[PDB]
């Protein structure tokens with residue numbers, strides 16, 4: 001294990017709020033001084049956990065690649081530790097470095113998943129509670145490093161400027177309903193290619209906080225779109241498959257509610273539901289009632305739920321599923337409505353994480 | 360720490376399924392032999408647990424009462440260990456003893472709740488002690504639910520339904536009844552109440568009435584409490600309105616589960632606060648009103664969990680709330696969920712993500 005990994009893994013990650021991230025964008029030098037230290041810390045924390053995995057998983061070519069990428073990215077970043085933030089060439093080189101790290105890490109999620117599959121096909125995955133624990137942490141860690149680097153790149157690079165209306169990747173006036181409708185349409189296009197029919201959307205909105213106004217919050221619309229798209233793929237598959245005997249499809253019903261503290265989105269289907277017994281299983285990485293695909297897939301890799309939940313929890317939200325077996329399912333996303341309360345939820349490698357590994 | 364309590368606490372509770380209770384309910388000697396052993400075991404297990412509680416709690420006159428009642432009952436029941444199952448008189452006497460016990464235990468829940476209120480009002484309670492008090496009270500009340508269930512069944516059978524078990528519990532009729540009980544209370548107190556909009560779906564046997572094996576009084580309790588809650592939230596959030604949004608309920612029978620969802624538009628609850636709702640004591644009402652005691656949610660969820668179902672609440676803050684009960688549909692899977700005083704419970708009485 002390189003000395004740099006051992007060192008930087010001694011620190012805890014420092015979580016930021018969305019409010020603070022929205023302020024990257026209101027000093028380059030301060031964001032450089034922070035990130036040059038924080039990205040190594042977060043890479044080093046997760047690399048210590050990678051080292052603890054089962055030998056037969058850690059030795060897959062896929063995990064060895066992710067480890068080699070993470071270690072290179074840490075080194076790339078530690079090379080900036082001697083530079084002055086007043087050094088304008090250093091700042092420029094730093095943006096180019098984050099662009100290289102971002103491009104290098106582009107296929108981390110699939111690569112890790114692939115390794116997880118080889119392991120499964122050769123040894124164990126859904127009944128291994130340490131692997132479930134690891135993957136929530138690893139993938140949350142990836143969400144958080146990609147969020148921080150992208151914020152710096154999209155505000156400070158010459159060439160990658162993101163949506164002119166966003167601050168980095170954050171929309172300070174995120175049109176929640178419009179994101180719902182867009183993710184619904186994305187899901188619908190895929191569902192049509194699998195079934196030649198898809199349910200319609202019936203949507204209702206309640207602005208409890210500012211009555212009769214458009215619902216907006218400060219949010220990262222790519223993360224919100226991901227959660228909704230995944231829950232809609234699941235609702236559409238459930239609905240079509242359960243109603244294949246019927247002349248028409250029940251709509252998917254969505255309600256979006258803005259209250260004082262929370263933004264809540266409930267997605268209700270008449271897709272026949274799930275036994276309460278298996279609800280927890282559903283949020284297990286790789287768990288799916290569909291065959292694992294080889295390769296435009298609607299279902300079967302078993303990532304939609306646990307990953308969508310990570311996105312909701314990342315800024316102190318949550319995602320829950322309540323089902324009525326024999327009828328249908330309610331999926332519910334909760335997001336904090338205040339940017340000052342939307343604080344990164346980060347894994348830390350410490351005694352208590354290590355130990356993790358009457359009625 | 361009497362001897363008999365230490366002795367019987369060494370056994371672990373023997374959980375029964377609802378099917379067992381039907382099958383042994385449709386031989387009095389067998390029930391007698393079973394219960395004169397099993398009741399002392401359950402009483403001794405919870406007694407040993409009472410002893411682990413904080414001193415200022417255990418020494419309230421309330422907890423001292425409960426402890427003397429439970430000890431006295433264990434002793435009354437241990438006295439039948441010297442009698443014969445084939446003995447018709449001992450059989451009669453045992454039923455009478457179970458009636459005494461039931462009478463003696465009649466005020467256990469308010470006496471325990473009184474003990475807790477006193478302690479929390481009087482004493483500083485650190486986070487960990489509070490957590491332990493929740494864990495203890497869930498276990499203590501579950502243990503009472505279970506002993507009352509066993510003793511009632513022997514009393515009703517030996518002194519259509521099999522004791523307190525209905526083998527064709529008309530789920531919807533219990534819903535309607537629990538709704539009307541709540542409604543009467545609501546009308547009397549707020550002068551108005553929401554209507555019920557009820558839907559049912561038999562996924563297991565389409566278009567047939569929904570019946571499972573259940574204990575209707577337990578189902579009634581859970582529904583009555585959840586409806587009180589939904590009615591108060593509706594009326595209070597809609598206090599400036601010409602009329603009230605109904606409370607909508609759907610009853611669904613699937614293969615493994617019976618599910619009942621109760622939906623209100625009484626304004627919801629922030630996610631922050633949802634877990635706190637289930638704390639014994641916790642109420643947004645001041646100290647007849649529908650609310651105040653802060654027992655509806657935790658106690659309903661014990662009834663639900665007792666035979667391996669569950670009770671969950673999810674809310675859209677600013678809009679309204681859904682409460683959901685899940686019951687097992689198969690009587691063989693409806694098995695008592697019982698606390699046991701073992702080294703793992705003991706450890707439970709005794710950070711990897713950043714804050």
Ligand SMILES: Nc1ncnc2c1ncn2[C@@H]1O[C@H](COP(=O)(O)OP(=O)(O)O)[C@@H](O)[C@H]1O
Pocket residue numbers: 230234235238269271272273274282283287288289290298299300301302303304305306329
């Ligand atoms: N709305 C729903 N209705 C019924 N079953 C669902 C629903 N959402 C998810 N599921 C079940 O949970 C499983 C896992 O979902 P997910 O993690 O999205 O993986 P995948 O879609 O690849 O199966 C699904 O395969 C399905 O069995």
Ligand SMILES: Nc1ncnc2c1ncn2[C@@H]1O[C@H](COP(=O)(O)OP(=O)(O)O)[C@@H](O)[C@H]1O
Pocket residue numbers: 584588589592623625626627628636637641642643644649650651652653654655656657680
């Ligand atoms: N349907 C609901 N809508 C809004 N708040 C609710 C609802 N159900 C319960 N609550 C909150 O949970 C609290 C506790 O409920 P409970 O444990 O039933 O005690 P109590 O009814 O005596 O307050 C209530 O005081 C209320 O604040």
Ligand SMILES: [Mg+2]
Pocket residue numbers: 230233234298299300303304305
């Ligand atoms: Mg999916």
Ligand SMILES: [Mg+2]
Pocket residue numbers: 584587588649650653654655656
């Ligand atoms: Mg109540």
